[PDB]
Design an enzyme around this catalytic site. Structure first.
Site, PDB file in Angstrom:
ATOM      1  N   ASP A 106      49.157  33.639  85.837  1.00  0.00           N
ATOM      2  CA  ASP A 106      50.257  32.708  86.102  1.00  0.00           C
ATOM      3  C   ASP A 106      51.138  33.199  87.246  1.00  0.00           C
ATOM      4  O   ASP A 106      50.905  34.271  87.800  1.00  0.00           O
ATOM      5  CB  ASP A 106      51.080  32.432  84.839  1.00  0.00           C
ATOM      6  CG  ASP A 106      51.975  33.593  84.440  1.00  0.00           C
ATOM      7  OD1 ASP A 106      52.050  34.600  85.182  1.00  0.00           O
ATOM      8  OD2 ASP A 106      52.619  33.486  83.374  1.00  0.00           O
TER       9      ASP A 106
ATOM     10  N   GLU B  95      52.707  23.086  82.920  1.00  0.00           N
ATOM     11  CA  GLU B  95      51.803  24.235  82.768  1.00  0.00           C
ATOM     12  C   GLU B  95      50.413  24.012  83.366  1.00  0.00           C
ATOM     13  O   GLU B  95      49.691  24.972  83.640  1.00  0.00           O
ATOM     14  CB  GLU B  95      51.625  24.601  81.290  1.00  0.00           C
ATOM     15  CG  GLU B  95      52.923  24.954  80.581  1.00  0.00           C
ATOM     16  CD  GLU B  95      53.447  26.322  80.956  1.00  0.00           C
ATOM     17  OE1 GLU B  95      52.776  27.038  81.718  1.00  0.00           O
ATOM     18  OE2 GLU B  95      54.537  26.694  80.477  1.00  0.00           O
TER      19      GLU B  95
END
Ligand SMILES: FC(F)(F)c1cnc[nH]1
Length: 175
Positions: A31, A22
């Site tokens: 993202d 992540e």
């Protein structure tokens, strides 16, 4: 394997794993799917409205952040999210038996997968869940690689897939 190489598995755990997948960002960003995110993979909201994302952030952290957090805050939130994924697996009648059957490293892959996709998303992977319980690792991995989860954002998911295949930490070596 060197003495050092054999120590590598003791340095890896779910937190280090997700931290690599992540990343760590102290400011709101979008993202790979374009959803507002912060910290270590914390999805704030799926709304395209940044205002909603900042509102969610202030709620999550408990202060006026104006879209920015500290490393210690990112870590606390991350710990909360990891706990939520584990709890989400253990209370679920479909996921718990599969998780229980897995070795420690693949259990980390399972928590990672749930952290990323959520409980219902993962619990819907009927064939993969069966394959994992039956130790059909190659089949499980090929089938995970068909998913929209992996295919829309391969770099976030690829190491998790390799981890389900091998049950080792090799995908997290030599960054
Ligand atoms: F069932 C779990 F939680 F072990 C799992 C998550 N992803 C595949 N299996």
């Amino acid at each position: 394997p060197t003495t050092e190489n054999l120590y590598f598995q003791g340095s890896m755990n779910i937190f280090e794993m997700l931290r690599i997948d992540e990343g760590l960002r102290l400011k709101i960003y979008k993202d790979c799917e374009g959803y507002y995110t912060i910290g270590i993979g914390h999805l704030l909201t799926k709304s395209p409205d940044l205002n909603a994302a900042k509102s969610e952030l202030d709620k999550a952290i408990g202060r006026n952040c104006n879209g920015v957090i500290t490393k210690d805050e990112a870590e606390k939130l991350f710990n909360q999210d990891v706990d939520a994924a584990v709890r989400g697996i253990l209370r679920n009648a479909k996921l718990k038996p599969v998780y229980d059957s897995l070795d420690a490293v693949r259990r980390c892959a399972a928590i990672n997968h749930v952290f990323q996709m959520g409980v219902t998303g993962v619990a819907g992977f009927t064939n993969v869940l069966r394959m994992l319980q039956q130790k059909r690792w190659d089949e499980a991995a090929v089938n995970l690689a068909k998913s929209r989860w992996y295919n829309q954002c391969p770099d976030r998911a690829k190491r998790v897939i390799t981890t389900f295949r091998t049950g080792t930490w090799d995908a997290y070596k030599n960054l």
